[PDB]
Design a binder for these strands. Sequence first.
RNA 1: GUUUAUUAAAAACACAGCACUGUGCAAACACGAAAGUGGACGUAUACGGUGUGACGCCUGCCCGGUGCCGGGAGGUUAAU
Lengths: 271, 77, 100, 149
Amino acid sequence: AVVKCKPTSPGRRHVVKVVNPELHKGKPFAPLLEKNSKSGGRNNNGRITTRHIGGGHKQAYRIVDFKRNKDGIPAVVERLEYDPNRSANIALVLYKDGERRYILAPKGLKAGDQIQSGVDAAIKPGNTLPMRNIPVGSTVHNVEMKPGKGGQLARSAGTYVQIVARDGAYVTLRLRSGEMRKVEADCRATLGEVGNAEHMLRVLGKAGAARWRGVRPTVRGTAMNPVDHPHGGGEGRNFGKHPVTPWGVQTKGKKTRSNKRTDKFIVRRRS
Amino acid sequence: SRVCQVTGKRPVTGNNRSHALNATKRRFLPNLHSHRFWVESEKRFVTLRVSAKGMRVIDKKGIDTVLAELRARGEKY
Amino acid sequence: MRHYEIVFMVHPDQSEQVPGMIERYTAAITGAEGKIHRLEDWGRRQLAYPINKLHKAHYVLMNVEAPQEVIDELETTFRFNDAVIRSMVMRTKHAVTEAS
Amino acid sequence: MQVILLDKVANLGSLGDQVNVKAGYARNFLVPQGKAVPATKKNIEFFEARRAELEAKLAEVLAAANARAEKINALETVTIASKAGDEGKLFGSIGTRDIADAVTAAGVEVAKSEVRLPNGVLRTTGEHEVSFQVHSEVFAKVIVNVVAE
RNA sequence: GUUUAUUAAAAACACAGCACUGUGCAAACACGAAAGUGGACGUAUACGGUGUGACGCCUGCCCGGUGCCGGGAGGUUAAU
């Protein structure tokens, strides 16, 4: 559940821990782990590109099966594991033929539930099927952008996409932010909402939960120098300017969405 | 690099002269495009990154003459 | 087991496929160990208001004694199907007979 | 363009015209498909005696051979008996591959690229009309009978 | 906790929390003439930027100027 900690020391007062008692306490399945080397926000040139990340505890990459290429095969969910690179939990699933795979764990999933995949999959949550046998109006997740891609949409904790319209070979979806967009009907999706919906309720308590996760402290623009930031300067807390990025681009309202290739797919913008 | 295969065009340098005649060095780039040509002498596809003036030259000449010039200059086709 | 009075409407070109659905539903009834009471197909007739257009839908009454797990599965096969539009299940009230 | 034409183009081609067209239509459609040859002072001499006198009638009898290839299958019907769902809702949508294989195994030996589907990927189980592009003018009227199993 | 190594350890910086803004993935943004990377083998309960800085009570008015967004009726408008 969501347990608020007692203020035994300065720092544990605001710690609110999301403790899932159904998670497996043990080592994960070893042939599905590979290395995940840290970068710290640096490209091949060695200069920093995505700032204010770095440090923290190590992690290994779990190979989560996205495509669900097996069709017409029953699947028994073995156990639930905590993936450190995600916001929701993952599920180790033992298939019928003996192959163990990591999948995304939905909301209504416990140890012992049976799922499947293919076009003959049912409407029970946890099944992966293309968008031509799904009834229009239900809740799906793990939505592919292109047929055979693997899945791009609705994979964080609690994120779900509701099917709105079905125009021939097109499926018009309402996304989580509220942007109506058309995708291919041949793309696959997994039914139900993504589990661990209480993950937003963790408020992390202290600076250390930001530090060992990989979130570096952010320096404000007023505290910086005029050579370091377009803001700053002055003899005591002077702002006097418009809010911009450190590279001269205006922020707090600026539409930078400009690719002109996927504007046909977008129906209604975010409001 | 940005070298045309047929005509041999390469980017040069010039001045960006404004209304106040401010000399600012910039680069003139050719209109290069990677087009896939059907060759009847070879009966196949040849991908060439050529200029559009070179495309007009190939529209004038035969494609076998252009491939013969590329063979004479030692270019890969 | 409880008496469940099922009424459902079917679209016409899929109402041509109604007797196979009746055979599947009575196979589920035979799996429920209950006896069927009303095999009266009411038939294709005129609707009173536009319900997902191309009017004159197909009425079917079932009225079978069944347990709760079988009627939950048979309701999920109703709600998850494009053929069954407006099914409903009613009370027992000592299930009934001719002159509908 | 001075490009001389070879095929019977349904808009401007009448077997030997010198109609001015754009370079993008000639370089990308006419040349790679063998529809036309760019004529600059030697291909005119090639078309003058060697092509228009003999090879035009060869193209005409190859069009007649394509008409005979259409006339191979006198039945003009395909009964697909693939696995289907419960009371409609077919298991897999049949594209041009299985239709081309079923026509090639018994009937017309035309390739997959000439097969056209007017009614989509044919999700509805029943009678369907499928036309073939064996010729630019004469079309096929194949009656495909999708049968549920 | 950190800071002006070598005159300033602080009310300065930073901090979990809160709000605004942008972004539907070949995302925004950044390094890089470009390829290619970071972001991220993450994807709207996520990421980036900005402002403030636990917690309780809260955050009232104004679109005149400037900044941002939308609409193109009308005027003006270079290159061809």
